[PDB]
Design a protein around this ligand. Sequence first.
Ligand SMILES: *[C@@H]1O[C@H](CO)[C@@H](O)[C@H](O)[C@H]1NC(C)=O
Lengths: 46, 48
Amino acid sequence: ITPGTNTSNQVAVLYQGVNCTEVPVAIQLTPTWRVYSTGSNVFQTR
Amino acid sequence: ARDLICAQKFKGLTVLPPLLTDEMIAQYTSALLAGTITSGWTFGAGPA
Ligand SMILES: *[C@@H]1O[C@H](CO)[C@@H](O)[C@H](O)[C@H]1NC(C)=O
């Protein structure tokens, strides 16, 4: 999820169909695509 | 029994949840009924 390259470089990443807790990148495919263990607050959505 | 849903989730078949939940969809219908009952057809054309 991106506001737009012109607007900003910040991005949001959604991991579909998984708990945040069991399988974050904090502990994985696309490892360089890390966004840190906690880049921000993790939010568990449906 | 594993049902069928995550039997299908394995082998990489996934169901994306709809953007609008069931509750909000029902909320939309409730608003439509309120407009029909209280304002007739007026709310559709413009201000209720
Ligand atoms: C996995 O996700 C579900 C739904 O988001 C949640 O209810 C459940 O608690 C999670 N697993 C654990 C061990 O918390």
